[PDB]
């Protein structure tokens, strides 16, 4: 018994991420925090367990005028914010061509708008077989289908044959092919596309476009950019989108959730890049329209907060340095998990950065339910176990790769 | 020249509201707030021209924990917020039957969701001929068509015949009929559908669905709920949604924006109301999914701030007492304009409540342009001039109608 539209009739979300986090904090309220390890949600908590609100960000944010907290922001977002995000995102790497940006609600809004405006209903959207689960829903809630290519070959190199084969397949059947790359610090694996592999990607994508029947739209979910590596090394690939043929458009979906540790402020920028000023202006206008059509403006105090900080050299250096403490702090946790994981013999995907590390298993769900017994609370995907290294203090990181590998060995995994 | 999908290309907002509003702000920043009449945006300013952020709301919002400021909130919203939003919306009038709520990005989010889930591609959506322009963009960006019925008969009463006529034409071409009512305190007019009229509206919808051909989805945008009249009076109509036939689903789009004075912060709930428990559950699930597919989740601090207040009796009465002082201010402002508009002979649509008053004319663009040179900023609609009384102190409101009449006379527009 349903009154919903034809395409909406059967929708129900199974959300593993959020309940699984719930029994976590549920075991950590009543029985004490330190007998529970929380590997669920992508939020940074410090060595003592508290959620990190970077104190430079919070200080700006709390000091704002009534107008910045409750006033309206323009539809496209605050122009200072739009310039500050591109500044932060690009670093010394800002590509040439025409760049135009629109404020979005997180990376989610970015991905939603990109898919709404650049694909037709029924179209397939491409990403790596290791990917953030929501992409599924962003496509499927709209009549699009998310399809995948094997990210890794046998030795864990970017798998170019798998990618090119899948792209050629979408290209044969639809004019626009949208491909989402989530890099650097891929969610779940932590993997980052290398500079040489971007070269091979773009060179292939330029060859495809020269045939003359397709446009390619390259989405890049950069959410983990500030958690992936040295400042210039992780951004250097941004130079590689300069002066691409106009049949290729690039959309960098940048977010403040991680970089500024504002999660529930819901704020991002989608940043379009084109050799062609008209194509780039169309990116701004069509995505501006979808914003008005959806949330109509994004959160003001969070936009104003990150613009203020980035424009004040003292304040911005103070913020880079507080964030880098927390990221050095994460990088080490993954060092401790990487070293013990290797000695004990536990398989784990090739992490270069990011909040998560994943253990490949076909059994993840089962292996997770017995982990929930140990007071170890983690996320189960179709491909394996995802663990939030952002959330796990040094205390429980060491000897953790043992407690997981020990659960799998008992069950035949 | 164009890479966007076929249905996307050409989209361009010509956005009047924020461009005018920007001009006003810059005028006032340079020349002082007290030297500009800023009738642009639906935000409250007090008798000094200061943006109002209610003391009880601000103190709670700034006093939140880090966890409540930056923590992710669940896809459907904070359960406490969903519960508090239904409670302050429905009052003593909560309808009977199955109720399920979902967090949205303001009222835009709720209506974006409603249209995405309850209409097929190409369908028509009905609203009054005086409406908030955003509805049109919501429809057209997703490939629907917003269509209108004349809100007023010749006496400036709810035009039941123009409306029923419109419903019939839609019901003849598609299964679902979505109708958006912006009441009480309509944007742009300030009109509120009266209770008897809701009876006649509802009676007609029941007859319509008794045929077996259609579902009706009634969207009610309640943004102005708290600015419209006495607490119980403005809410009384909610009881009329008790046990409607299951072919009628009522969606109440609530916002924090105006009620709590977080204007820029688009935070609301869409509250579904159905007699049939599976209808309501379905409302919950298609809308949660679309929340994940669009914004993933809603601003956490705004939600908690509101749940906290509504759940505290002492903080709740104090918040209301604060909001009420400002509601009175907006009343007086509208009374002044009306008195004076009637004296100078300047026509005006009927204003019950809300932040805006509208002057009908097909000349708004030329008129507004002239008013600017006088440091008066109002918004030009296609059919009229929208004035936000919420943003215009009394001493400024005095003489305003005369000035608008005089601009229309000088420009040869009567
Ligand atoms: O008055 C306000 O609330 C702000 C409006 C604004 O900044 C804009 O023009 O986008
Ligand atoms: O929000 C989610 O789906 C899970 C998460 O931790 C993130 O990647 O932000
Ligand atoms: O936001 C707009 O388009 C105009 C406005 O003042 C409101 O009704 O919220
Ligand atoms: Cl569809």
PDB file of N, CA and C in Angstrom, chain A residues 1-6 8 11 15 53 58 61 66 69-72 108-109 112 116-120 141 176 215 217 258 261-266 282 285 289-290 292-297 301, chain B residues 2-7 11 42 53 58 61 66 69-70 72 75 108-109 112 116-117 119-120 132 141 176 215 258 261 263-266 278-279 282 285-286 289-290 293-297 299-301:
ATOM      1  N   UNK A   1       0.812  -1.225   0.000  1.00  0.00           N
ATOM      2  CA  UNK A   1       0.000   0.000   0.000  1.00  0.00           C
ATOM      3  C   UNK A   1       0.856   1.292   0.000  1.00  0.00           C
ATOM      4  N   UNK A   2       0.938   1.941  -1.164  1.00  0.00           N
ATOM      5  CA  UNK A   2       1.931   2.988  -1.428  1.00  0.00           C
ATOM      6  C   UNK A   2       1.293   4.088  -2.253  1.00  0.00           C
ATOM      7  N   UNK A   3       1.497   5.346  -1.864  1.00  0.00           N
ATOM      8  CA  UNK A   3       1.188   6.499  -2.728  1.00  0.00           C
ATOM      9  C   UNK A   3       2.410   7.147  -3.449  1.00  0.00           C
ATOM     10  N   UNK A   4       3.612   6.647  -3.194  1.00  0.00           N
ATOM     11  CA  UNK A   4       4.824   7.237  -3.771  1.00  0.00           C
ATOM     12  C   UNK A   4       4.930   7.107  -5.296  1.00  0.00           C
ATOM     13  N   UNK A   5       5.770   7.932  -5.903  1.00  0.00           N
ATOM     14  CA  UNK A   5       5.999   7.874  -7.346  1.00  0.00           C
ATOM     15  C   UNK A   5       6.611   6.530  -7.780  1.00  0.00           C
ATOM     16  N   UNK A   6       6.435   6.158  -9.040  1.00  0.00           N
ATOM     17  CA  UNK A   6       6.833   4.846  -9.521  1.00  0.00           C
ATOM     18  C   UNK A   6       8.268   4.454  -9.098  1.00  0.00           C
ATOM     19  N   UNK A   8      10.168   5.707  -6.746  1.00  0.00           N
ATOM     20  CA  UNK A   8      10.447   5.763  -5.317  1.00  0.00           C
ATOM     21  C   UNK A   8       9.846   4.605  -4.490  1.00  0.00           C
ATOM     22  N   UNK A  11      12.101   2.066  -2.058  1.00  0.00           N
ATOM     23  CA  UNK A  11      13.276   2.573  -1.361  1.00  0.00           C
ATOM     24  C   UNK A  11      13.241   2.318   0.141  1.00  0.00           C
ATOM     25  N   UNK A  15      21.391   1.067   6.617  1.00  0.00           N
ATOM     26  CA  UNK A  15      22.595   1.837   6.926  1.00  0.00           C
ATOM     27  C   UNK A  15      23.414   1.158   8.010  1.00  0.00           C
ATOM     28  N   UNK A  53      37.552  19.250  17.997  1.00  0.00           N
ATOM     29  CA  UNK A  53      37.081  20.434  17.292  1.00  0.00           C
ATOM     30  C   UNK A  53      38.320  21.278  17.298  1.00  0.00           C
ATOM     31  N   UNK A  58      37.218  26.581  16.141  1.00  0.00           N
ATOM     32  CA  UNK A  58      36.150  26.784  17.096  1.00  0.00           C
ATOM     33  C   UNK A  58      36.198  28.221  17.624  1.00  0.00           C
ATOM     34  N   UNK A  61      34.783  30.507  14.862  1.00  0.00           N
ATOM     35  CA  UNK A  61      33.367  30.161  14.807  1.00  0.00           C
ATOM     36  C   UNK A  61      32.516  30.708  15.975  1.00  0.00           C
ATOM     37  N   UNK A  66      26.278  37.930  15.159  1.00  0.00           N
ATOM     38  CA  UNK A  66      24.936  37.389  14.942  1.00  0.00           C
ATOM     39  C   UNK A  66      24.626  37.231  13.469  1.00  0.00           C
ATOM     40  N   UNK A  69      26.333  33.995  12.050  1.00  0.00           N
ATOM     41  CA  UNK A  69      25.599  32.792  12.496  1.00  0.00           C
ATOM     42  C   UNK A  69      24.256  32.594  11.836  1.00  0.00           C
ATOM     43  N   UNK A  70      23.370  33.589  11.959  1.00  0.00           N
ATOM     44  CA  UNK A  70      21.995  33.519  11.388  1.00  0.00           C
ATOM     45  C   UNK A  70      21.620  34.235  10.089  1.00  0.00           C
ATOM     46  N   UNK A  71      22.518  35.011   9.495  1.00  0.00           N
ATOM     47  CA  UNK A  71      22.139  35.652   8.251  1.00  0.00           C
ATOM     48  C   UNK A  71      22.030  34.641   7.099  1.00  0.00           C
ATOM     49  N   UNK A  72      21.478  35.070   5.972  1.00  0.00           N
ATOM     50  CA  UNK A  72      21.463  34.255   4.767  1.00  0.00           C
ATOM     51  C   UNK A  72      22.784  34.346   4.029  1.00  0.00           C
ATOM     52  N   UNK A 108      28.853  15.101  -0.263  1.00  0.00           N
ATOM     53  CA  UNK A 108      27.592  14.523  -0.738  1.00  0.00           C
ATOM     54  C   UNK A 108      26.790  15.407  -1.751  1.00  0.00           C
ATOM     55  N   UNK A 109      26.587  16.662  -1.364  1.00  0.00           N
ATOM     56  CA  UNK A 109      25.921  17.613  -2.217  1.00  0.00           C
ATOM     57  C   UNK A 109      26.655  17.775  -3.523  1.00  0.00           C
ATOM     58  N   UNK A 112      25.997  14.608  -5.567  1.00  0.00           N
ATOM     59  CA  UNK A 112      24.608  14.727  -6.043  1.00  0.00           C
ATOM     60  C   UNK A 112      24.415  15.709  -7.262  1.00  0.00           C
ATOM     61  N   UNK A 116      23.398  14.793 -11.088  1.00  0.00           N
ATOM     62  CA  UNK A 116      22.107  15.321 -11.603  1.00  0.00           C
ATOM     63  C   UNK A 116      22.303  16.079 -12.923  1.00  0.00           C
ATOM     64  N   UNK A 117      23.252  17.006 -12.961  1.00  0.00           N
ATOM     65  CA  UNK A 117      23.499  17.847 -14.139  1.00  0.00           C
ATOM     66  C   UNK A 117      24.335  17.274 -15.288  1.00  0.00           C
ATOM     67  N   UNK A 118      25.178  16.280 -14.987  1.00  0.00           N
ATOM     68  CA  UNK A 118      26.019  15.663 -16.022  1.00  0.00           C
ATOM     69  C   UNK A 118      25.660  14.277 -16.581  1.00  0.00           C
ATOM     70  N   UNK A 119      24.641  13.651 -15.997  1.00  0.00           N
ATOM     71  CA  UNK A 119      24.123  12.369 -16.489  1.00  0.00           C
ATOM     72  C   UNK A 119      22.591  12.390 -16.754  1.00  0.00           C
ATOM     73  N   UNK A 120      22.161  11.513 -17.655  1.00  0.00           N
ATOM     74  CA  UNK A 120      20.746  11.299 -17.954  1.00  0.00           C
ATOM     75  C   UNK A 120      20.230  10.155 -17.056  1.00  0.00           C
ATOM     76  N   UNK A 141      19.022   6.525  -5.933  1.00  0.00           N
ATOM     77  CA  UNK A 141      17.866   7.346  -5.577  1.00  0.00           C
ATOM     78  C   UNK A 141      17.330   8.163  -6.768  1.00  0.00           C
ATOM     79  N   UNK A 176      27.963  11.112 -22.197  1.00  0.00           N
ATOM     80  CA  UNK A 176      28.730  11.537 -21.025  1.00  0.00           C
ATOM     81  C   UNK A 176      29.106  10.305 -20.186  1.00  0.00           C
ATOM     82  N   UNK A 215      31.921  13.077 -24.006  1.00  0.00           N
ATOM     83  CA  UNK A 215      32.510  13.959 -23.021  1.00  0.00           C
ATOM     84  C   UNK A 215      32.865  13.084 -21.834  1.00  0.00           C
ATOM     85  N   UNK A 217      33.504  13.536 -17.663  1.00  0.00           N
ATOM     86  CA  UNK A 217      33.479  14.376 -16.486  1.00  0.00           C
ATOM     87  C   UNK A 217      34.132  13.671 -15.334  1.00  0.00           C
ATOM     88  N   UNK A 258      36.451  17.266   7.211  1.00  0.00           N
ATOM     89  CA  UNK A 258      37.718  16.761   7.718  1.00  0.00           C
ATOM     90  C   UNK A 258      38.742  17.880   7.952  1.00  0.00           C
ATOM     91  N   UNK A 261      37.500  19.942  10.571  1.00  0.00           N
ATOM     92  CA  UNK A 261      36.811  19.206  11.629  1.00  0.00           C
ATOM     93  C   UNK A 261      35.477  19.846  11.971  1.00  0.00           C
ATOM     94  N   UNK A 262      34.736  20.237  10.941  1.00  0.00           N
ATOM     95  CA  UNK A 262      33.319  20.490  11.114  1.00  0.00           C
ATOM     96  C   UNK A 262      32.582  19.424  10.273  1.00  0.00           C
ATOM     97  N   UNK A 263      32.042  18.410  10.945  1.00  0.00           N
ATOM     98  CA  UNK A 263      31.198  17.394  10.298  1.00  0.00           C
ATOM     99  C   UNK A 263      29.695  17.783  10.134  1.00  0.00           C
ATOM    100  N   UNK A 264      29.079  18.227  11.222  1.00  0.00           N
ATOM    101  CA  UNK A 264      27.647  18.438  11.224  1.00  0.00           C
ATOM    102  C   UNK A 264      27.277  19.851  10.847  1.00  0.00           C
ATOM    103  N   UNK A 265      28.249  20.598  10.321  1.00  0.00           N
ATOM    104  CA  UNK A 265      27.962  21.888   9.695  1.00  0.00           C
ATOM    105  C   UNK A 265      27.614  21.720   8.214  1.00  0.00           C
ATOM    106  N   UNK A 266      27.983  20.558   7.658  1.00  0.00           N
ATOM    107  CA  UNK A 266      27.587  20.201   6.300  1.00  0.00           C
ATOM    108  C   UNK A 266      28.045  21.201   5.229  1.00  0.00           C
ATOM    109  N   UNK A 282      28.704  27.306 -17.493  1.00  0.00           N
ATOM    110  CA  UNK A 282      27.605  26.358 -17.416  1.00  0.00           C
ATOM    111  C   UNK A 282      27.670  25.509 -16.142  1.00  0.00           C
ATOM    112  N   UNK A 285      26.427  27.903 -13.401  1.00  0.00           N
ATOM    113  CA  UNK A 285      24.961  28.210 -13.492  1.00  0.00           C
ATOM    114  C   UNK A 285      24.086  26.955 -13.262  1.00  0.00           C
ATOM    115  N   UNK A 289      21.697  26.464  -9.900  1.00  0.00           N
ATOM    116  CA  UNK A 289      20.254  26.222 -10.025  1.00  0.00           C
ATOM    117  C   UNK A 289      19.846  24.989  -9.137  1.00  0.00           C
ATOM    118  N   UNK A 290      20.638  23.929  -9.219  1.00  0.00           N
ATOM    119  CA  UNK A 290      20.325  22.745  -8.414  1.00  0.00           C
ATOM    120  C   UNK A 290      20.379  23.034  -6.921  1.00  0.00           C
ATOM    121  N   UNK A 292      19.568  26.012  -5.382  1.00  0.00           N
ATOM    122  CA  UNK A 292      18.323  26.695  -5.104  1.00  0.00           C
ATOM    123  C   UNK A 292      17.234  25.655  -5.104  1.00  0.00           C
ATOM    124  N   UNK A 293      17.331  24.696  -6.009  1.00  0.00           N
ATOM    125  CA  UNK A 293      16.337  23.633  -6.060  1.00  0.00           C
ATOM    126  C   UNK A 293      16.369  22.639  -4.885  1.00  0.00           C
ATOM    127  N   UNK A 294      17.353  22.736  -4.020  1.00  0.00           N
ATOM    128  CA  UNK A 294      17.531  21.668  -3.038  1.00  0.00           C
ATOM    129  C   UNK A 294      17.636  22.166  -1.616  1.00  0.00           C
ATOM    130  N   UNK A 295      18.748  22.782  -1.252  1.00  0.00           N
ATOM    131  CA  UNK A 295      18.870  23.389   0.069  1.00  0.00           C
ATOM    132  C   UNK A 295      18.854  24.933   0.135  1.00  0.00           C
ATOM    133  N   UNK A 296      18.996  25.515  -1.044  1.00  0.00           N
ATOM    134  CA  UNK A 296      18.969  26.937  -1.424  1.00  0.00           C
ATOM    135  C   UNK A 296      20.047  27.881  -0.835  1.00  0.00           C
ATOM    136  N   UNK A 297      20.610  27.575   0.314  1.00  0.00           N
ATOM    137  CA  UNK A 297      21.943  28.076   0.652  1.00  0.00           C
ATOM    138  C   UNK A 297      22.527  27.233   1.757  1.00  0.00           C
ATOM    139  N   UNK A 301      27.724  30.312   9.161  1.00  0.00           N
ATOM    140  CA  UNK A 301      28.873  30.484  10.055  1.00  0.00           C
ATOM    141  C   UNK A 301      30.075  29.581   9.668  1.00  0.00           C
TER     142      UNK A 301
ATOM    143  N   UNK B   2      28.731  23.450 -24.569  1.00  0.00           N
ATOM    144  CA  UNK B   2      27.967  22.755 -23.503  1.00  0.00           C
ATOM    145  C   UNK B   2      28.278  21.257 -23.294  1.00  0.00           C
ATOM    146  N   UNK B   3      28.781  20.898 -22.111  1.00  0.00           N
ATOM    147  CA  UNK B   3      28.944  19.487 -21.709  1.00  0.00           C
ATOM    148  C   UNK B   3      27.857  18.885 -20.802  1.00  0.00           C
ATOM    149  N   UNK B   4      27.024  19.739 -20.221  1.00  0.00           N
ATOM    150  CA  UNK B   4      25.974  19.304 -19.285  1.00  0.00           C
ATOM    151  C   UNK B   4      24.931  18.408 -19.946  1.00  0.00           C
ATOM    152  N   UNK B   5      24.252  17.596 -19.127  1.00  0.00           N
ATOM    153  CA  UNK B   5      23.207  16.701 -19.607  1.00  0.00           C
ATOM    154  C   UNK B   5      22.047  17.466 -20.338  1.00  0.00           C
ATOM    155  N   UNK B   6      21.410  16.828 -21.329  1.00  0.00           N
ATOM    156  CA  UNK B   6      20.416  17.509 -22.152  1.00  0.00           C
ATOM    157  C   UNK B   6      19.368  18.336 -21.374  1.00  0.00           C
ATOM    158  N   UNK B   7      18.807  17.761 -20.312  1.00  0.00           N
ATOM    159  CA  UNK B   7      17.776  18.414 -19.481  1.00  0.00           C
ATOM    160  C   UNK B   7      18.283  19.552 -18.592  1.00  0.00           C
ATOM    161  N   UNK B  11      19.933  26.089 -18.120  1.00  0.00           N
ATOM    162  CA  UNK B  11      19.474  26.558 -16.806  1.00  0.00           C
ATOM    163  C   UNK B  11      20.293  27.789 -16.379  1.00  0.00           C
ATOM    164  N   UNK B  42      13.614  38.127   4.182  1.00  0.00           N
ATOM    165  CA  UNK B  42      12.692  37.654   5.194  1.00  0.00           C
ATOM    166  C   UNK B  42      13.330  37.498   6.570  1.00  0.00           C
ATOM    167  N   UNK B  53      18.552  37.929  16.636  1.00  0.00           N
ATOM    168  CA  UNK B  53      18.864  36.538  16.903  1.00  0.00           C
ATOM    169  C   UNK B  53      18.452  36.325  18.360  1.00  0.00           C
ATOM    170  N   UNK B  58      20.270  32.031  20.934  1.00  0.00           N
ATOM    171  CA  UNK B  58      21.699  32.251  20.772  1.00  0.00           C
ATOM    172  C   UNK B  58      22.513  31.700  21.929  1.00  0.00           C
ATOM    173  N   UNK B  61      22.776  27.968  21.655  1.00  0.00           N
ATOM    174  CA  UNK B  61      23.504  27.560  20.469  1.00  0.00           C
ATOM    175  C   UNK B  61      25.035  27.687  20.674  1.00  0.00           C
ATOM    176  N   UNK B  66      31.388  20.506  21.928  1.00  0.00           N
ATOM    177  CA  UNK B  66      32.077  20.316  20.635  1.00  0.00           C
ATOM    178  C   UNK B  66      31.334  19.252  19.894  1.00  0.00           C
ATOM    179  N   UNK B  69      28.363  20.689  18.442  1.00  0.00           N
ATOM    180  CA  UNK B  69      28.718  21.601  17.338  1.00  0.00           C
ATOM    181  C   UNK B  69      29.210  20.975  16.028  1.00  0.00           C
ATOM    182  N   UNK B  70      30.254  20.136  16.114  1.00  0.00           N
ATOM    183  CA  UNK B  70      30.779  19.434  14.933  1.00  0.00           C
ATOM    184  C   UNK B  70      30.457  17.961  14.667  1.00  0.00           C
ATOM    185  N   UNK B  72      28.636  14.506  13.494  1.00  0.00           N
ATOM    186  CA  UNK B  72      27.639  14.090  12.500  1.00  0.00           C
ATOM    187  C   UNK B  72      26.305  13.837  13.167  1.00  0.00           C
ATOM    188  N   UNK B  75      21.060  10.367   9.558  1.00  0.00           N
ATOM    189  CA  UNK B  75      20.485  10.690   8.281  1.00  0.00           C
ATOM    190  C   UNK B  75      19.066  11.291   8.396  1.00  0.00           C
ATOM    191  N   UNK B 108      12.920  24.380   1.707  1.00  0.00           N
ATOM    192  CA  UNK B 108      13.332  24.000   0.350  1.00  0.00           C
ATOM    193  C   UNK B 108      13.608  22.489   0.274  1.00  0.00           C
ATOM    194  N   UNK B 109      14.346  21.983   1.256  1.00  0.00           N
ATOM    195  CA  UNK B 109      14.638  20.572   1.341  1.00  0.00           C
ATOM    196  C   UNK B 109      13.371  19.743   1.371  1.00  0.00           C
ATOM    197  N   UNK B 112      11.671  19.840  -1.993  1.00  0.00           N
ATOM    198  CA  UNK B 112      12.562  19.113  -2.938  1.00  0.00           C
ATOM    199  C   UNK B 112      12.319  17.615  -2.791  1.00  0.00           C
ATOM    200  N   UNK B 116      10.350  15.128  -5.460  1.00  0.00           N
ATOM    201  CA  UNK B 116      11.136  14.006  -5.937  1.00  0.00           C
ATOM    202  C   UNK B 116      10.415  12.665  -5.623  1.00  0.00           C
ATOM    203  N   UNK B 117       9.853  12.531  -4.437  1.00  0.00           N
ATOM    204  CA  UNK B 117       9.256  11.229  -4.112  1.00  0.00           C
ATOM    205  C   UNK B 117       7.828  10.911  -4.554  1.00  0.00           C
ATOM    206  N   UNK B 119       5.957  12.673  -7.263  1.00  0.00           N
ATOM    207  CA  UNK B 119       5.557  13.058  -8.595  1.00  0.00           C
ATOM    208  C   UNK B 119       6.421  12.330  -9.619  1.00  0.00           C
ATOM    209  N   UNK B 120       5.830  11.964 -10.761  1.00  0.00           N
ATOM    210  CA  UNK B 120       6.572  11.388 -11.882  1.00  0.00           C
ATOM    211  C   UNK B 120       7.264  12.504 -12.696  1.00  0.00           C
ATOM    212  N   UNK B 132       6.250  31.795  -3.304  1.00  0.00           N
ATOM    213  CA  UNK B 132       7.683  31.950  -3.198  1.00  0.00           C
ATOM    214  C   UNK B 132       8.346  31.334  -4.429  1.00  0.00           C
ATOM    215  N   UNK B 141      13.917  22.463 -12.169  1.00  0.00           N
ATOM    216  CA  UNK B 141      15.267  21.913 -12.202  1.00  0.00           C
ATOM    217  C   UNK B 141      15.221  20.380 -12.325  1.00  0.00           C
ATOM    218  N   UNK B 176      -0.969  11.290  -9.195  1.00  0.00           N
ATOM    219  CA  UNK B 176      -0.723  12.037  -7.981  1.00  0.00           C
ATOM    220  C   UNK B 176      -0.889  13.511  -8.217  1.00  0.00           C
ATOM    221  N   UNK B 215      -4.328  10.036  -6.129  1.00  0.00           N
ATOM    222  CA  UNK B 215      -3.812  10.442  -4.813  1.00  0.00           C
ATOM    223  C   UNK B 215      -3.536  11.951  -4.767  1.00  0.00           C
ATOM    224  N   UNK B 258      12.497  30.885  10.474  1.00  0.00           N
ATOM    225  CA  UNK B 258      11.788  32.056  10.976  1.00  0.00           C
ATOM    226  C   UNK B 258      11.426  31.918  12.436  1.00  0.00           C
ATOM    227  N   UNK B 261      14.614  32.164  14.452  1.00  0.00           N
ATOM    228  CA  UNK B 261      15.516  33.183  13.978  1.00  0.00           C
ATOM    229  C   UNK B 261      16.877  32.624  13.638  1.00  0.00           C
ATOM    230  N   UNK B 263      18.105  32.287  10.220  1.00  0.00           N
ATOM    231  CA  UNK B 263      17.375  32.541   8.965  1.00  0.00           C
ATOM    232  C   UNK B 263      18.146  31.923   7.850  1.00  0.00           C
ATOM    233  N   UNK B 264      19.460  32.086   7.937  1.00  0.00           N
ATOM    234  CA  UNK B 264      20.354  31.564   6.937  1.00  0.00           C
ATOM    235  C   UNK B 264      20.451  30.073   7.118  1.00  0.00           C
ATOM    236  N   UNK B 265      20.068  29.583   8.283  1.00  0.00           N
ATOM    237  CA  UNK B 265      20.386  28.181   8.556  1.00  0.00           C
ATOM    238  C   UNK B 265      19.218  27.354   8.113  1.00  0.00           C
ATOM    239  N   UNK B 266      19.388  26.593   7.043  1.00  0.00           N
ATOM    240  CA  UNK B 266      18.150  26.058   6.509  1.00  0.00           C
ATOM    241  C   UNK B 266      17.997  24.707   7.158  1.00  0.00           C
ATOM    242  N   UNK B 278       1.159   2.076   6.635  1.00  0.00           N
ATOM    243  CA  UNK B 278       2.188   1.764   5.629  1.00  0.00           C
ATOM    244  C   UNK B 278       2.555   3.003   4.752  1.00  0.00           C
ATOM    245  N   UNK B 279       1.555   3.853   4.495  1.00  0.00           N
ATOM    246  CA  UNK B 279       1.783   5.145   3.833  1.00  0.00           C
ATOM    247  C   UNK B 279       2.841   5.944   4.598  1.00  0.00           C
ATOM    248  N   UNK B 282       6.332   4.442   4.576  1.00  0.00           N
ATOM    249  CA  UNK B 282       6.887   4.704   3.264  1.00  0.00           C
ATOM    250  C   UNK B 282       7.385   6.171   3.149  1.00  0.00           C
ATOM    251  N   UNK B 285      10.772   6.305   4.768  1.00  0.00           N
ATOM    252  CA  UNK B 285      11.874   5.636   4.066  1.00  0.00           C
ATOM    253  C   UNK B 285      12.313   6.242   2.737  1.00  0.00           C
ATOM    254  N   UNK B 286      11.376   6.729   1.915  1.00  0.00           N
ATOM    255  CA  UNK B 286      11.757   7.301   0.624  1.00  0.00           C
ATOM    256  C   UNK B 286      12.435   8.618   0.902  1.00  0.00           C
ATOM    257  N   UNK B 289      16.006   8.076   2.399  1.00  0.00           N
ATOM    258  CA  UNK B 289      16.937   7.687   1.332  1.00  0.00           C
ATOM    259  C   UNK B 289      17.422   8.930   0.510  1.00  0.00           C
ATOM    260  N   UNK B 290      16.481   9.810   0.222  1.00  0.00           N
ATOM    261  CA  UNK B 290      16.751  10.988  -0.596  1.00  0.00           C
ATOM    262  C   UNK B 290      17.572  11.969   0.211  1.00  0.00           C
ATOM    263  N   UNK B 293      20.916  10.760  -0.279  1.00  0.00           N
ATOM    264  CA  UNK B 293      21.391  10.905  -1.651  1.00  0.00           C
ATOM    265  C   UNK B 293      21.677  12.347  -2.035  1.00  0.00           C
ATOM    266  N   UNK B 294      21.358  13.266  -1.132  1.00  0.00           N
ATOM    267  CA  UNK B 294      21.484  14.693  -1.436  1.00  0.00           C
ATOM    268  C   UNK B 294      22.387  15.497  -0.478  1.00  0.00           C
ATOM    269  N   UNK B 295      21.986  15.658   0.778  1.00  0.00           N
ATOM    270  CA  UNK B 295      22.866  16.285   1.784  1.00  0.00           C
ATOM    271  C   UNK B 295      23.573  15.445   2.870  1.00  0.00           C
ATOM    272  N   UNK B 296      23.250  14.146   2.899  1.00  0.00           N
ATOM    273  CA  UNK B 296      23.639  13.090   3.834  1.00  0.00           C
ATOM    274  C   UNK B 296      23.138  13.288   5.266  1.00  0.00           C
ATOM    275  N   UNK B 297      22.993  14.531   5.674  1.00  0.00           N
ATOM    276  CA  UNK B 297      22.509  14.873   7.016  1.00  0.00           C
ATOM    277  C   UNK B 297      22.479  16.379   7.188  1.00  0.00           C
ATOM    278  N   UNK B 299      22.323  20.157   9.566  1.00  0.00           N
ATOM    279  CA  UNK B 299      23.122  20.803  10.564  1.00  0.00           C
ATOM    280  C   UNK B 299      22.752  20.380  11.983  1.00  0.00           C
ATOM    281  N   UNK B 300      23.759  19.822  12.644  1.00  0.00           N
ATOM    282  CA  UNK B 300      23.595  19.217  13.952  1.00  0.00           C
ATOM    283  C   UNK B 300      23.354  20.228  15.070  1.00  0.00           C
ATOM    284  N   UNK B 301      24.177  21.304  15.117  1.00  0.00           N
ATOM    285  CA  UNK B 301      23.976  22.326  16.165  1.00  0.00           C
ATOM    286  C   UNK B 301      22.581  23.020  16.127  1.00  0.00           C
TER     287      UNK B 301
END
